[PDB]
Amino acid sequence: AQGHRLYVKAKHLSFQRSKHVIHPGTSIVKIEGCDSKEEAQFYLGKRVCYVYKSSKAVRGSKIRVIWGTIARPHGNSGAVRARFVHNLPAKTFGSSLRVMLYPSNI
Amino acid sequence: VRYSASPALETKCAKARGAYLRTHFKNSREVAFTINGMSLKKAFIFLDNVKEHKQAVPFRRFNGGVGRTAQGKEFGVTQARWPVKSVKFFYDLLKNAEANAEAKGLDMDKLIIKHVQVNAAPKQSSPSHIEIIVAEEEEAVPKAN
Amino acid sequence: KYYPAYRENVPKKARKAVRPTKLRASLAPGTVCILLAGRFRGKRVVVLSQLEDTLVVTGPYKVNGVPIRRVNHRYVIATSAPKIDVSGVSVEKFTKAYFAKQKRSGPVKKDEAFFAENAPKNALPAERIADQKAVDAKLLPAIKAIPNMKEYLAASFALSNGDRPHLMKF
Amino acid sequence: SEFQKVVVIDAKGHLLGRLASVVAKQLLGGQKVVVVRCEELNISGHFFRNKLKYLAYLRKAFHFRAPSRIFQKAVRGMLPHKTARGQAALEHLQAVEGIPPPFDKQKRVVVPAALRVLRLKPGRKYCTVGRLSSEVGWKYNDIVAKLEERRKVKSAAFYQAKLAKQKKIASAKEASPVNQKLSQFGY
Amino acid sequence: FRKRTGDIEVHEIAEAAAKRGYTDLLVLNEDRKKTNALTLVHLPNGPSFYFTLSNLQTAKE
Amino acid sequence: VNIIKKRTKPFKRHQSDRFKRVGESWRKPRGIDSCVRRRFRGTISMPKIGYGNNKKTRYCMPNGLKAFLVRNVSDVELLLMHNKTYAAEIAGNVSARKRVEIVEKARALGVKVTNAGAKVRSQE
RNA sequence: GUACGUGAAAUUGCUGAAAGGGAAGCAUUGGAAAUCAGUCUUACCUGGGUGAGAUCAGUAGUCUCUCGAGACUAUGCA
RNA sequence: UCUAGUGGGCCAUUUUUGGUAAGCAGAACUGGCGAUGCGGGAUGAACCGAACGUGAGGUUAAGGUGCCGGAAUGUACGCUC
RNA sequence: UUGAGAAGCUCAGACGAGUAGGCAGGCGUGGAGGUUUGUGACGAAGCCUUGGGCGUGAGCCUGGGUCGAACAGCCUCUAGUGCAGAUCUUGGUGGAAGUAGCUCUAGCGAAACCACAGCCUGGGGAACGGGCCAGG
RNA sequence: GAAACGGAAGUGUUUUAUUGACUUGUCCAUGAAAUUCCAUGUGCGGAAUCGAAUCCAUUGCAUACGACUUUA
């Protein structure tokens, strides 16, 4: 089944936050394989999605997606800042996100 | 007249009421909770037992100051009492509801207590409004298709 | 009905001019390219020519079953595989009107719109298959000459464990 | 770098605090972590140092002695255990003494940021958690220190069988001419 | 069941359905997400009845 | 100039949820020691002039029109020159007979009606 | 239905759903579930055919205003 | 020209007098809090930043970047177990 | 170019804590004069509602339900004109509690009290504690 | 259809006997499209049943009551 997955695995770590104030509009995403802020420049502007399933079979489907884009790197270790169309729920801390390769400049 | 419950549609139900009854609201509330859902014939036997102290009515919400008994082990609780004023009113209302069903032509061997409610009458002591709806046990018709 | 009946907030003259799209230097005609989205995601196809913004792309229909299609240059990866000879096939017939969806005319009556007695279908005409066959004939010898390329276009690109696209080169 | 669904860590030679902080961050990152050989963890400081630290802890609570329970306590203090997120992250950690049968046949990784040989200065006294636990109440040290040889002997036999089996393909590799005919790609 | 399209009227539906082999036409009038009326027409030129509905309940209810 | 709302939540009076005797209509706190008046952290917001909305888009419904209250056919005819700016809203106490007359007139004038389906049935 | 127009809140009972572990309610952001709102292509332009009628008659009268301005009544439809 | 409100203190710093087991007390001075929310300081009425219309984006201050906790288990040179 | 409610329209720049106190503009209620050739038994007013909308806000408009005879917008006049507190007044109703009482019972049946929840160790300087911070 | 091994929490490691297939090992011929530029048995409520347990004949062994222990 290794003829698929055009995307890259990622994890939703947290929102942008200070010690005591959280900003849910921007989320901190750890793209796996990206290990520094210079490698995070490749994934800037790429589409990222959160894919989950819900009980109702609305649209005749069991899966729904929240889309987003990668805006800028966060820190030195390769984490990025992502803004989603809808703010990611706080329950999705440590959940998985998919980073496509489009819009591609390669 | 209108009751608290959407049932009591004439075809398969029978109603009975008692308003401004000279009995305590809290004791009547506990008796209503116990006999709710029971079969009509089973409820009559249980109410007779409470009169004869064979079975105990488990005081459940207003259980403050109520002594526990072994006869409450059936209901999964401990506190219990043997009210006779509340039981007498409920027995009379059940007799009325049974008589109403007999007039309606209902099937008498399938009657269960679908809805029994106790409400606070105006403070005259605390009187009580009691309304009972007994309806036929609805069976499922086999599809056979 | 013609004299304006309202304030008529006419837009100010906007100084925006349409200028040709500057595509990447790696998206030359004939380069093998990986499709990123759509129903043909993961396929490898040959870039015939560049439209104004999109790339008129197709895989040899006898190879991967990707017909003459348009692809946005952002949803494509320009690989460094050896280029295919595409100067032979004329691409002047591939314009935006060639790929444009048919405009809605809908000649019906209010007797068959009810009951859904229309069944309007616009299956691909024969000339489109003829054009695809002509392109395939002019492209297959080019991909046959260079080795390990015919089935390379038949395969579908995918990412495996440990693949880092920011480090991998295409 | 990359994550797996379950990560098994061989805690032999790993510092308690360094490994716990890495594990706690991985637990909050959304990963299931299994730490085996929790009795082989190391703590910087002499035997008497952490002895008085644990003896003072005994003076204070449910005093746990098992090495995994020591490690589980260290990881828990590095988690937001007062919230649902911290509790959920805790339940993804499985710390055990030794390597149980479900895990001795699975690959075990190590954390270089927590290894004693790469973090402690040579010639510094250290206290093993298993040895430290043995005198403070833990009574299963001898039986687990005896069973490890049985696991090691079985595992060593497996490696020899795997190595002997691998020799056939390794010889067959250079035997096939196509291995070197197109080895210009670096493979 | 045929979804009502455009601006075809009941008499036009009736005269069109009379040529399709249908014999009775039922039109459910609804307004603000509630069916409240039903006009049944006997085809091709039979009597037309108009009822106003109430207490609409489905099987799940 | 699409419609932008600086805020969609209402301003509820402090402690209005705690007490049923206290209504939720906004009241400016007067207590000096009250943390809401001092505008501490985590406390509820207060009506400020900065929350005010754009003058051009003020009073505009989400469809870009302004609700104009209508009580008879004379009021509908007033919006002949302003059907792109205003929507007719029939008053609540206008009977179902007048509502019908208003709705037919507004239809010829090309005037949107906010509550054109009230108190009436349809029969095609 | 005389415990009688309307019938609020506090409060009480039953039923249904959901949440439960101790500062709590509350604020911010989204998820899920339930529910709701409005926004529709339909018209416009153009051509011909067929008939129609007036604010058109190389047209005849009446009325009310100030020659011509409105309202009509016959007759023809280029 | 007239015309509302106030006619205190606290934190104390600094200069400073007497001191007295030693602390401490006494003057002036200096500003702040007092009418002031916000970032930090584990938490904090007076410490470090900064003073406020509703928002988007960017960048910082004081503090920080093992985990809790956003951010290098960074680089280089030393002390200590 | 129509953009003269000249009390309108328009252009530009700067600024925005706030007690006492000062000064403007508004929202709402009862009644009065005028007005809308106003609304109303084809349903006024009130009330209910996880319906919709408008205003920074006071508030206002509206759908549905209930209901059954009156009522409102605008200009002006007028005042017994807006409540969470007063150990407020009157009325209604709670927890205590089916407790005190007159083992389990049978009947009858209170009152005081009530801002609100309620596991501990330390610190939060003005008690900080129960309510914050760090832990168990 | 299987036999062995695996005890620490073996729950899996092989050995296969075959029975069928894909066989990317490699070379060819067809089909892919107007998706004509991204959007992606299981649970509940009832019954007829089979056991078991409690109450129960019980008992003081337990005992404000609960609840407990023996025996019909």
DSSP letter string, C20-46 = -----TT--TT-EEEE-SSTTTTBEEE
Do D and F touch, counting CB pairs below 8 Å (3 needed)? no
Closest nt by CA–C1' to A55: G32
Which residues on adjacent β-strands are paired with residue C35?
C76
Which helix (H) or strand (E) is C123 found in, with range?
A: none
CA distance A68 to A86: 8
State in Å, rounded, how far the first CA of chain E is from the last one. Answer: 23
- CB-nearest to E32 from F117, F123, F124 is F117
Which nt is closest to the CA of C8, judged by C1'? I1
CA gap F101, A100 in Å, rounded: 58
Distance from CA of A77 to the nearest CA of D (A): 10
Closest residue by C-alpha to C1' distance, nucleotide G25 = F18
C93 close to A (CB below 8 A): no
The DSSP bridge pattern shows strands D6-10 and D32-36 to be: parallel
User: Exposure string (b/e) for B57-94, b if CB count within 10 Å is 16 or more?
Assistant: bbbbeebeebeebebbeebeeebbbbbeebbebbbebb
Task: F50-56: list long-range contacts, CB under 8 Å, 24+ apart.
Answer: F50/F6, F51/F6, F51/F7, F52/F6, F53/F4, F53/F5, F53/F6, F54/F1, F54/F4, F56/F1
| Residue reference for tokens 């489907």 | A61
The CA R_g of chain E, rounded to the nearest whole Å, is: 13
Neighbours of B49 (CB within 10 A): 16
Tell me which chain C residues have a C-beta less than 8 angstroms from the C-beta of A39. Answer: 166-167
Phi then psi dihedrals of residue F76, to 5 deg: -70, -40
Report which of residues 92-131 in chain C place their beta carbon less than 7 angstroms from any atom of strand J: 96, 98-102, 122-125, 128-129
What domain count does chain B have? 1
Label the pairing between strands B111-120 and B128-136.
antiparallel
Backbone angles phi, psi at D53, to 5 degrees: -65, -45
Torsion of CA C130, C133, C135, C137, to 10 degrees: -140
Give distance CA E56 / C1' G9 (Å).
Answer: 35
What are the residues whose beta carbons fall under 8 Å from the beta carbon of D116, sequence distance 6 or more?
Answer: D13, D14, D15, D42, D126
D142: its two tokens: 């001898």
Task: In whole angstroms, give the CA distance from residue C84 to residue C45.
Answer: 11
Domain edges within chain A:
1-106
Q: From CA F31, how far away is CA F45, in angstroms rounded? A: 16
Point out which residues pair with E51 in neighbouring strands. Answer: E38
- Cα B27 to chain centroid distance, Å, stands at 12
Nominal resolution (angstroms): 3.0
What gap in Å lies between CA A15 and CA A88, rounded to an integer? 9
Distance CA C98, CA C100 (A): 6
**Exposure b/e, A8-31, CB count within 10 A at least 16 = b:** bbbbbbbbbeeeeeeeeebbbbbb
Q: How many Å from the N-terminal Cα to the C-terminal Cα in chain A?
A: 26
Q: What approach was used to elucidate this structure?
A: cryo-EM
Spatial contact of C71 and C77, defined as CB atoms under 8 Å apart: no
Under an 8 A CB cutoff, do C113 and E13 touch? no
Q: How far apart are CA B7 and CA B35, in angstroms?
A: 18
Closest Cα to residue D66, out of D157, D122, D144? Answer: D144
> Tell me, what amino acid is at D33?
V
- In chain D, positions 4-43 with C-beta closer than 7 Å to nucleic chain H are 17-18, 20-22, 24-25, 28
ω into D112 cis (within 30 of 0): no
Whether residues E10 and F117 touch (CB distance < 8 A) is answered with no
Instruction: Please state, in angstroms and rounded to a whole number, the distance separating the CA atoms of residues B5 and B132.
Output: 10
* Residues F75-109 as b or e (16 or more Cβ within 10 Å = b): bbeebeeebeebbbbbeeebeeebbeebbebbeeb
Helical H runs in chain F?
35-38, 73-77, 96-109
Q: Within 10 Å of residue B36's Cβ, how many Cβ atoms?
A: 15
Nucleotides of G under 7 A from a protein CB: 3, 9-15, 25-34, 36-39, 41, 44-45
DSSP H stretches of helix in D92-140: 101-104, 116-119, 129-134
| C1' (I128) to CA (A65) span, angstroms | 49
The CA distance from F16 to F26, in Å, is 9
Q: Give the integer Cα–Cα distance in Å for F75 and A81.
A: 55
How many CA atoms are closer than 13 Å to the CA of D154, on its beta-carbon side? 8
E13 touches chain C (CB under 8 A): yes
F1 touches strand H (CB under 7 A): no
Q: Which chains touch F (3 or more CB pairs under 8 A)?
A: C, E
> How deeply is D55 buried, as exposed, middle or buried, from its count of CB atoms within 10 A (0-12, 13-18, 19+)?
exposed
Contact B134, B144 (CB under 8 A): no
Whole-number Å distance between alpha carbons of A50 and A45: 16
**Rounded (to 5) percent helix, strand, coil in chain E:** 15, 35, 55
C-alpha C41/C-alpha C20 separation (Å) is 27
Question: Distance (Å, rounded) from C-alpha C31 to C-alpha C78?
Answer: 7
Read off φ and ψ for residue B118, nearest 5 degrees. -125, 125
Whether residue E4 lies within 8 A of chain C, CB to CB, comes out as yes
CA distance C153 to C31: 11
Can you give the residue range of the structural domain that contains C150? 1-170
Which residues are CB-neighbours of B54 under 8 A, at least 6 positions away?
none
Q: Which residue has the tokens 């027409």?
A: E41
Cβ pair C134, C89 in contact under 8 A: yes
Run of H or E including C4:
none
Domain count, chain C: 1
CA distance F92 to C3: 37
Q: In what order do the strands lie in the sheet with C54-58?
A: C69-72, C54-58, C44-50, C32-35, C76-78
Q: How far apart are CA B73 and CA F21, in angstroms?
A: 45
Encode burial over F51-65: b for 16+ CB neighbours within 10 A, e otherwise. eeeeeeeeebeeeeb
Pick from D172, D167, D140: which is nearest to D38 by CA? D140
Between CA E18 and CA E23 the distance in angstroms is: 7
Task: Identify which of C96, C93, C103 has the alpha carbon closest to the alpha carbon of residue C132.
Answer: C93
The one-letter code for the residue type at D94 is Q
Q: How far apart are CA E39 and CA E14, in angstroms?
A: 12
Integer Cα distance of E20 and D116 in angstroms: 88
> Dihedral of CA C135/C138/C143/C144: which sign?
positive
For D59, other C-beta atoms within 10 Å of its C-beta total 8
Phi, psi of F115 (to 5 degrees): -125, 50
The rounded distance, in Å, linking the Cα atoms of B116 and C123 is 68
Cα E43 → chain centroid: 12
**Nearest 5 degrees, angle CA B91-CA B96-CA B101?**
125
Chain C interface disruption, residue of E4, E5, E12, E20, most C CBs within 10 A:
E5
The interaxial angle of helices D67-77 and D16-28, nearest 10 deg, is 60
- Determine which of A5, A8, A11 to mutate to test the interface with D (most D C-beta atoms within 10 Å): A11
Distance between CA atoms of residues F36 and F13, nearest Å? 10
**Do the beta carbons of residue B14 and residue B97 sit within 8 Å?**
yes
CA F108 to chain E, closest CA, distance in angstroms equals 18
Cis bond leading into C11, ω under 30°?
A: no
CA distance F70 to F44: 38
Length of chain E: 61
Distance CA E23, CA E19 (A): 10
Instruction: Give the Cα separation of C21 and C30 in Å (integer).
Output: 19
CA of E27 to C1' of J35 (A): 36
Structure tokens at F109: 């004038």
For residue D42, give both structure tokens.
């190391």
Alpha-carbon Rg of chain F, whole angstroms?
A: 21
